[PDB]
Amino acid sequence: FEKMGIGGLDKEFSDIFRRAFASRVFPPEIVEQMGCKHVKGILLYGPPGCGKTLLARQIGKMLNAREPKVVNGPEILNKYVGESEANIRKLFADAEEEQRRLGANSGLHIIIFDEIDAICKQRGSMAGSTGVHDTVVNQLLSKIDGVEQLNNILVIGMTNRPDLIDEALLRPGRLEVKMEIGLPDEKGRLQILHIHTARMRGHQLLSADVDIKELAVETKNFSGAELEGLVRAAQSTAMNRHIKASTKVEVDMEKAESLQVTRGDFLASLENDIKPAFGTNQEDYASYIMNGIIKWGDPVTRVLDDGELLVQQTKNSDRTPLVSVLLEGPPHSGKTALAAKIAEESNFPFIKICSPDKMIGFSETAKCQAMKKIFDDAYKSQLSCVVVDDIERLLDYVPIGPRFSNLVLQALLVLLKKAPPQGRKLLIIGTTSRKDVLQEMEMLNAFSTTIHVPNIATGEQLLEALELLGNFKDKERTTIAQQVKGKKVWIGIKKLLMLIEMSLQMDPEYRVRKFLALLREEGASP
Amino acid sequence: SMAEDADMRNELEEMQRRADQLADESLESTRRMLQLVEESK
Ligand SMILES: Nc1ncnc2c1ncn2[C@@H]1O[C@H](COP(=O)(O)OP(=O)(O)OP(=O)(O)O)[C@@H](O)[C@H]1O
Ligand SMILES: Nc1ncnc2c1ncn2[C@@H]1O[C@H](COP(=O)(O)OP(=O)(O)O)[C@@H](O)[C@H]1O
Description:
Chain A: Keywords: Acetylation, ATP-binding, Cytoplasm, Hydrolase, Magnesium, Metal-binding, Nucleotide-binding, Phosphoprotein, Protein transport, Repeat, Transport. Chain A: This is Vesicle-fusing ATPase. This is part of a larger assembly, with chains A (about 525 residues) and B (about 40 residues). Chain A has helices at about 10-20, 30-35, 55-60, 75, 85-90, 95-100, 135-145, 185-205, 210-220, 225-245, 255, 265-270, 285-290, 300-315, 335-345, 365-380, 405-415, 435-440, 460-470, 475-485, 495-505, 510-520, and strands spanning about 40-45, 70, 110-115, 155-160, 180, 320-330, 355, 385-390, 425-430, 450. Chain A has about 525 residues and is of the alpha/beta class. In chain A, the strands form two sheets. Chain A has a five-stranded parallel beta sheet. Chain A has a five-stranded parallel beta sheet with strand order 7-8-9-6-10, with helices on both faces. Chain A is globular and about 105 Å long. The termini of chain A are far apart. Chain B is mainly α. Chain B is built from one helix and no strands. Chain B is rod-shaped and about 85 Å long. The termini of chain B are far apart. Classes of the chains: A alpha/beta (about 525), B mainly alpha (about 40). Bound molecules: adenosine-5'-triphosphate and adenosine-5'-diphosphate (ADP). Adenosine-5'-diphosphate (ADP) binds near residues 7, 51, 52, 192 and 224 of chain A.
């Protein structure tokens, strides 16, 4: 299969060849002897940018057919009445005319529909509740197979929402076959890399230190389009580095010209402007964790151990492919940082974080759609780890009333039990701050376990935290230690940070008294 | 909510038939008449 542009998918081509084109290679005499008609359509569904248009083109060019006609679904729609039907009909005039002119001796045509899910939806059944775009669906249904006969056509459809297609359009009379394309495995990624680097290998623009086999693992959940972007960005960066360095000294151009084979280029493109849409993100931790982890006490070790145990349990279990855990604690205790640290230590391929910050002013329906989209994207991998943050802020809970958005709570409750398709495991970590309220709505029974994160409990722990931070000296250290010798301390780490920052703003001599007074003013008992 | 029909903008009268070569031919005859009339004198 590698002789042509596409490569990596063979189990998804044997079936498509067999159940759709067995009659297109047998000698015509036997076909007419039996008297069976050819297939009239096929359907393909998968993630975007996974090698669909190339396969659709190749399946046409391999059949000795004419030029394909590319059509985009969104462009078909128009505001004036009676134009969408004309646009749809315009794509069949040539086939009809050729068939009429040449009888039954005509060739084969092709049509490439893209995003067909936007011009086909379940038509309303109730009177007065019909869809606003039923004319297009009616026209397409009539044209595909109507009173008049067509026997020299073949329709290919593409989409990403295989659940919104009208049922009537998928019966064995129209588009009787389907196929799916998943994320290529390591072998497929290696094959794509070698196909696209065949040019460099032939023209001697590749180094011996660049090992495609090793680099394959560095791409865990990449896509073909992303691979083409990575290669092109690496070549552009190599050219830029070449011009910059070679112009530095009056050295022969040939020496620098061959220097573009460096593995530096590829690693730089890798960590440069290549941001996968189905892979771990690295620039959000800085926001969600600003100062790392400081081991001011035992509880951190226990929490990390429990996180690792949960990760191992989900990774090495077969009867429970779904695991949930709820983090709770007093306000300003630092839950999000620990959640992010656990997620990072998970070492999973796909780690997407959902937070309320990116929904300011969104309506409830928008939030539900965003949640559904995130979960749908997380389903498409062999592993995942989602992190629901706050929760109490998604619901809009307010002590007066109480008031909250019912639909978001219902969506969360329903989604915390749906299991992914066979063989694909998933993990959900949630962080809240008011466990009693969650227990009141009868949600705490949906989760599988709870973990407790306490606050600072004793003065010596505060002394250890101050020592780790390193902002006060030994004299003031001892002064504070003797002043707060008693074990009656209760303060949050983030609050401690803000208090220290404020205290630093005072005059150098008048600082200890300020900090002590501020600490005394703040709560010192549960 | 379907943009209703619109009245045909209007008519822009424009008529072109077979004048070019018909009047060029008409001319080529007058020129020859002029030449002959000049020659007689
Ligand atoms: N061992 C630690 N545990 C928790 N937080 C830590 C630790 N060491 C340092 N921090 C700091 O604690 C800060 C707490 O972060 P954050 O503001 O998200 O806390 P939170 O308690 O989850 O928030 P909120 O009070 O808004 O619910 C983090 O930015 C991190 O810099
Ligand atoms: N399996 C594959 N083999 C070859 N090229 C691929 C493959 N998968 C993706 N590509 C490349 O991805 C690029 C963009 O994909 P595109 O043609 O837009 O298809 P899609 O409809 O999946 O987005 C193309 O240049 C194509 O060469």
